[PDB]
Amino acid sequence: AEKRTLIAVIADEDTTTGLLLAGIGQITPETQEKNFFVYQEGKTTKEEITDKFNHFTEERDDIAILLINQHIAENIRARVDSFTNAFPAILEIPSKDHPYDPEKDSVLKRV
Amino acid sequence: LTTAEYLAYQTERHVLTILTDMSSYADALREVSAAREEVPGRRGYPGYMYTDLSTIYERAGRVEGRNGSITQIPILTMPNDDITHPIPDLTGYITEGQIFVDRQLHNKGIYPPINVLPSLSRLMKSAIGEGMTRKDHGDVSNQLYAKYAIGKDAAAMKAVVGEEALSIEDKLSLEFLEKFEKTFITQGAYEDRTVFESLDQAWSLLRIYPKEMLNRISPKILDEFY
Amino acid sequence: AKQKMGRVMQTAAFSLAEVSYATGENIGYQVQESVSTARFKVRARQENVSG
């Protein structure tokens, strides 16, 4: 929708820093919410990552494209599979030192 | 038909009988049959309508010793715009072709409102030849029929999958359909188009296609007439 | 586009690592601090492909 104008980033620290340098993600002052939240495997937990992804997909209506790390998506594979709705889109970008896995991609799995 | 038989066979001239409202003739048959105690048949018409129509139609035809012919244009009037009616069914059984006048064409102001998809002449291959007409007649007619069917398909397809997504063979076919219905089929009531002029118009319509697209036409005729 | 994404993310990660090495510190904290507004936005367009 036209309301969804943002690029959510839930990838690793390096990928989150790169996205922030690009300017895709930001923290809304009035809403006290960050479009791009830095999260790693050690940081927070799998349940916290899944909750953040669900909030970005549904609660964060402004989010249009979601960028999640492949390592992060591995622990959130169930959430990725459950996110069958086209909007917001999900991109299976991988983190540092981890090659992208076509099999692990949820969108490519439908093929 | 007695006048036609006389002229054609005892005078050696071609006739072309044009009967009109054979539906009215069948209604008269119904009235005559029920004047007797005959029980009505399938749709009220007598059971021997097949025999009566067969006599009236097959009164025509060429013969051996006589250099004369009788042609028939029965011209029915389909009651409920259906072919399953006994009059069109029997007329199609005895006769040797169909020419269909379409309400869809008539409501668009196209005269004559004849649609060439249901209409056919089973004996066309004999009439359209090389010594007769011009040698491209049959292939031109087949190509026109194929491209008109493609035009109807593309006209239905445009409102489903958008104009842009249509292929080149669909967009050019839509253009051909428009030009065909509005210029070829659409004929002035008093405009006399000889077969050669009509074939030239048909070639003019077909020329919008590159020579590679016209596939039902034989290569020699395509190379010579295009 | 998946192959292009793989190569582009590889080169972007390499460039980010080079920039971090040149700066001598992780700029992620500074980027997160300067996240008041987003300079990049995406607007949906109703492209009509086929029907």
The DSSP-derived string for A23-73 is: T---EETTTTEESB----SSSS-HHHHHHHHHIIIII-TT--EEE--HHHH
Using a CB-CB distance cutoff of 8 angstroms, which residues of chain A are in contact with residue C16?
14, 17-18, 21
Nearest to C38 by CA among A35, B203, A84: A35
Collect all residues with Cβ–Cβ distance below 8 Å to B117 and sequence separation of at least 6. B100, B145, B148, B149, B152
Nearest to B179 by CA among B154, B155, B202, B205: B205
Domains in chain A: boundaries: 1-111
Token pair recorded at residue B109: 């102001």
Distance from CA of B176 to the nearest CA of C (A): 22
Burial zone of B8 (CB within 10 Å; 0-12 exposed, 13-18 middle, 19+ buried): buried
Longest dimension (CA), chain B: 66
Given CB atoms, is A102 within the 8 Å cutoff of chain C?
yes
Token pair recorded at residue B95: 């006769």
Distance from CA of A69 to the nearest CA of C (A): 11
How large is the C-alpha radius of gyration of chain A? Answer: 13
How far is A36 from C33, CA to CA, in rounded Å?
Answer: 12
Return the residue of C nearest to B166 by Cα.
C50
- Answer positive or negative: Cα dihedral of B166, B168, B173, B179: positive
Nearest to B127 by CA among B93, B96, B94, B90: B96
SS3 B160: helix
Contact between B57 and B95 under an 8 Å Cβ cutoff? The reply is yes
How far is C4 from B144, CA to CA, in rounded Å?
Answer: 48
Position of tokens 């999640």? A68
Q: Do C16 and A93 touch (CB under 8 A)?
A: no
Burial zone of A55 (CB within 10 Å; 0-12 exposed, 13-18 middle, 19+ buried): middle
Using a CB-CB distance cutoff of 8 angstroms, which residues of chain A are in contact with residue C4?
none
Distance from CA of C5 to the nearest CA of B (A): 29
Residue environment code for B176-210, b if the CB has 16+ CB neighbours within 10 A, otherwise e = bbebbbeebbbbeeeeeeeeeeebebbeebbeebe
How far is B38 from B76, CA to CA, in rounded Å?
Answer: 24
Pairing between β-strand A7-9 and β-strand A65-67 as defined by DSSP bridges? parallel
Which method resolved this structure?
A: cryo-EM
Nearest to B187 by CA among B76, B109, B83: B109
Nearest to B47 by CA among B22, B26, B78: B26
Of C27, C36, C39, the CB nearest to A17: C27
